[PDB]
Amino acid sequence: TICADGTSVANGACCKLIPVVKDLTENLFEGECGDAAHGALRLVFHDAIAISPTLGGGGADGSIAVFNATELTFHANTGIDDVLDAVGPFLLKHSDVMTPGDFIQLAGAVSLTQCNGAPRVKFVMGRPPPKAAAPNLLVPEPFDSVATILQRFGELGFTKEETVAVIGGSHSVAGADDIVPNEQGIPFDQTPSIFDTQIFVDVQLRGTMIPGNGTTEGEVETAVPGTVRLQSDHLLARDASTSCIWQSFVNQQSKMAQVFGEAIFKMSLLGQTQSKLIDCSEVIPRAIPFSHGPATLPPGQTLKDIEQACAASPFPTLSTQPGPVTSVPAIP
């Protein structure tokens, strides 16, 4: 079917989503891989992962928006109130054509296309409205152990490879608003507007510093001024179950993107039955091709500053970016 805009879709029910995509790209994200895009991506996880085989929760069901009055009382959802302040008006204005679970997955898929190197993910619609708030304690916290993290993701059907890709990859285009005391927009990697593998390098370095005037539980030292490091990422890069996976993504942007895209799509289906959904992948914007060079070590860092954790292979011999140590700019 040809939509009013000229887009051909396999299922004509998808045509009603085209204005939603345009609104998100023009008016929420403003064509940028910035604060709004980051929020929409994070919302995908906080909505979808909140499901357990034994404790309940509906997964990718829109509960985090509909039942925000409950789910925003959960510690793991710190900062989601601010995300919903930005995204929530768009969810409401487009609630005539799609359910909230569908909207959240759409917005995350569209967010990625705003970012250099991020994959164009598949997208399906047809998730029913949510029945209830997720239980508490289903969203992983940055102070959770690797074993805890792998149990949560693994029990939901993710491989370890997918788990590392989807966490690390997301943190390549991300910052913290609630970790560095009284500071917002503090990136996890040197390039929060680029979907590159700098996050993988940055986290493998020995940490030497904390930003700001104190820590929050689940934060550890970072190696690069103007960034922050989560304990969870720190441990995932160093634990024997995940460290070879973590290292495998360094300077492998295409591989990382492909795995990430597969993982996001899997995440999008949590709590759903793929049978009763409709493919609407044609509505997702074109991806922005990765246009940056190889991964590098940050200025002033050398291979002796890498904490080797993968026993199978040495850390790739990357170049060091030229020039003086500089503080990474905060995300506007």
Ligand code: HEM
């Ligand atoms: C063990 C798993 C994970 C943990 C513990 C974790 C933890 C965090 C924390 C603590 C923050 C900063 C939040 C704030 O300061 O308010 C954050 C930001 C973010 N996370 Fe993760 N995360 C995980 C997995 C993921 C996944 C799977 C995705 C995407 C599907 C994701 C996407 C993001 C994004 C995009 C941001 C930045 C938000 C912004 O700049 O507004 N995270 N994460």
Ligand SMILES: [Ca+2]
């Ligand atoms: Ca949910």
Ligand SMILES: [Ca+2]
């Ligand atoms: Ca990056």
